[PDB]
């Protein structure tokens, strides 16, 4: 897939992702906070179409993600992220996608997710997160 | 003076300041690095004119500031930053301004300056720096 | 279980854990690095006995953990950590315990584990890790 790396910011204001219940997550875009002002990150798009869009608007700065979980599994021969769930101190967003395959979860006791990096071909191949106080 | 706060970034690429040898530092602007791309910070300008401009272009990322020093003193009844010197691992930039008053210096053994905040009326009233690994 | 919290240190030199292939992880103790000197953490012991001991001696500071994975599952009605695997830049230690239940994994691209906290009753109930640059 096509690798992307948004880098580190001051916080997260909005997450826009898309998915298809028969396959996996497709598009991924984040609106970050950059020292108090919104910073629109690059839209990381799948090579194909046919994904329902989802908008997660956080009540920044009072609402922030405390846990990210999901599933990775095989789709057409390759391992991809098939599902994602975002839990904030306010509520749970998701699951979005297919909850099948191998689960993973990253609960955070102290700290904040301040950035994302990953790769997308037809679907989200993998992803990593920047953490900071 | 008019307070300003650029916030925290990933590094510093260029510093643009101005001064007058009879008074103090006037204008202050920084080109930051934001995850590998230049990010032009707001130009913080003095209310008056009559300052010689200085451009400090750093060979980012191999060159970075290791020490900031200067002088604060009285100009027309108020305390202001009258002089600044920037020392990198490559060379020394300055002193710029008037080296009179009370000296101050911030040598850094480990870490990086990643942002500035302060206030400017006719001159740079004061300033603070964001530090990070 | 009995909660424990070693806190944050400068690095990890040695990990001592115990387990039983029919149940879960039992004892857990860590030798940390504290500014260049070994710091022996408190031995966190299970209320019962019958666990094979394991000693993981890291070639500190050149060898450090890059991924922690394991399984959590039900043992006698309660959820516990049944298995742990430690992968360093040098080799893989484990799996130790029973690889059954729900998997979890924490790969680290940048940063270090510098501390542990958790709880132990008959077995390791849960655990969290301190991360730092």
């Amino acid at each position: 897939g096509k690798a992307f790396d948004d880098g580190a910011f001051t916080g997260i204001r909005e997450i826009n992702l898309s998915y298809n219940k028969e396959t996996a997550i497709g598009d991924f875009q984040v609106v970050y906070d950059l020292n108090g002002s919104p910073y629109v990150g690059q839209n990381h798009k799948s090579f194909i179409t046919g994904f329902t869009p989802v908008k997660i608007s956080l009540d920044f700065p009072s609402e922030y993600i405390m846990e990210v979980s999901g599933y990775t599994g095989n789709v057409s021969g390759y391992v991809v992220v098939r599902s994602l769930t975002f839990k904030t101190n306010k509520k749970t967003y998701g699951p979005y996608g297919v909850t099948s395959g191998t689960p993973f979860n990253l609960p955070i006791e102290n700290g904040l997710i301040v950035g994302f990096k990953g790769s997308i071909g037809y679907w989200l191949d993998y992803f990593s997160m920047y953490l900071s106080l | 003076g008019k307070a300003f706060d650029d916030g925290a970034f990933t590094g510093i690429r260029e510093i643009n300041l101005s001064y007058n040898k009879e008074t103090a530092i006037g204008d202050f602007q920084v080109v930051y690095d934001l995850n590998g791309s230049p990010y032009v910070g707001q130009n913080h300008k003095s209310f008056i004119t009559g300052f010689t401009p200085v451009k400090i272009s750093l060979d980012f990322p191999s060159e970075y500031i290791m020490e900031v020093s200067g002088y604060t003193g009285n100009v027309s009844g108020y305390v202001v930053v009258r002089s600044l010197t920037f020392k990198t691992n490559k060379k020394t930039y300055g002193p710029y301004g008037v080296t009179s008053g009370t000296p101050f210096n911030l040598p850094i053994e480990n870490g990086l300056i990643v942002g500035f905040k302060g206030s400017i009326g006719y001159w740079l009233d004061y300033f603070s720096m964001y530090l990070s690994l | 279980g009995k909660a424990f919290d070693d806190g944050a240190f400068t690095g990890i030199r040695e990990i001592n854990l115990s387990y039983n292939k029919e149940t879960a992880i039992g004892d857990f103790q860590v030798v940390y690095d504290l500014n260049g000197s070994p710091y022996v953490g408190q031995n966190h012991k299970s209320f019962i006995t019958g666990f094979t001991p394991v000693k993981i001696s890291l070639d500190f500071p050149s060898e450090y953990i890059m991924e922690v994975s394991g399984y959590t599952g039900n043992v006698s009605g309660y959820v516990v950590v049944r298995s742990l695997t430690f992968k360093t830049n040098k080799k893989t230690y484990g799996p130790y315990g029973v690889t059954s239940g729900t998997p979890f994994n924490l790969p680290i691209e940048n940063g270090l584990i510098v501390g542990f906290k958790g709880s132990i009753g008959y077995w390791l109930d849960y655990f969290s890790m301190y991360l730092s640059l």
């Binding site: 950035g115 990096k117 993998y126 990593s128 920047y130 | 990322p61 | 924490l106 940048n110 940063g111 640059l133």
Partner: peptide, 16 residues
């Protein structure tokens, strides 16, 4: 060290 700020990064999850 270089003049680039660092941050803790965890992952990746998905295709290794």
């Amino acid at each position: 060290q270089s003049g680039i700020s660092q941050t803790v990064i965890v992952g990746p999850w998905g295709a290794k």
